[PDB]
Amino acid sequence: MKSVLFVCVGNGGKSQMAAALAQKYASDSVEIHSAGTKPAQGLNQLSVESIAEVGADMSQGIPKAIDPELLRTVDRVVILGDDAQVDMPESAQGALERWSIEEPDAQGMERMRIVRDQIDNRVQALLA
């Protein structure tokens, strides 16, 4: 697992968080990307703050569309949550994953930290 594209719908929240957490743990030998099937107008600032709280940074992140050459060539395409849909091309050299996110009975920052911590667990597992 030497390259990963994290994907969700807007590329403002979970996928940026996953990308920020992965960078925080990964060696330089791992290329880390994030993208959205429908890129948002900007970042989820709650996501931004949740990431800042654990000493990572996604504040420089930019919501962006899925690059077909990245999609085709990364080792892992990881969809966060239930909504985003990605159909791996036949030529794809990598494999598709989907991580479910258990919605907490909370809102705002309390909720976002719970989301972050779930993503954290998975990203550490992914890089292991």
Swiss-Prot record:
Write down the EC number: 2.8.4.2
Q: Which biological process annotations from GO are given for this protein?
A: response to arsenic-containing substance
Name the species this protein comes from: Corynebacterium glutamicum (strain ATCC 13032 / K051)
Question: Which family, according to the similarity comment?
Answer: Belongs to the low molecular weight phosphotyrosine protein phosphatase family.
Q: What is the lineage of its organism?
A: Bacteria, Bacillati, Actinomycetota, Actinomycetes, Mycobacteriales
Tell me the SUPFAM superfamilies matching this sequence: Phosphotyrosine protein phosphatases I
* UniProt subcellular location: Cytoplasm
**A single Gene Ontology molecular function, please?**
mycothiol-arsenate ligase activity
- Which branch of life, at top level? Bacteria
Q: What is the protein's given name?
A: Arsenate-mycothiol transferase ArsC2
- Does the record's keyword annotation contain Nucleotide-binding? no
| Record-linked SMART domains | LMWPc
Record field: catalytic activity: mycothiol + arsenate = arseno-mycothiol + H2O
One Pfam family for this entry, by name? Answer: LMWPc
Q: Write out the entry's keywords from A to Z.
A: Arsenical resistance, Cytoplasm, Transferase
Its biological function?
Involved in defense against toxic arsenate. Involved in the mycothiol/myoredoxin redox pathway which uses a mycothioltransferase mechanism; facilitates adduct formation between arsenate and mycothiol.
Would you name any one GO CC term? cytoplasm
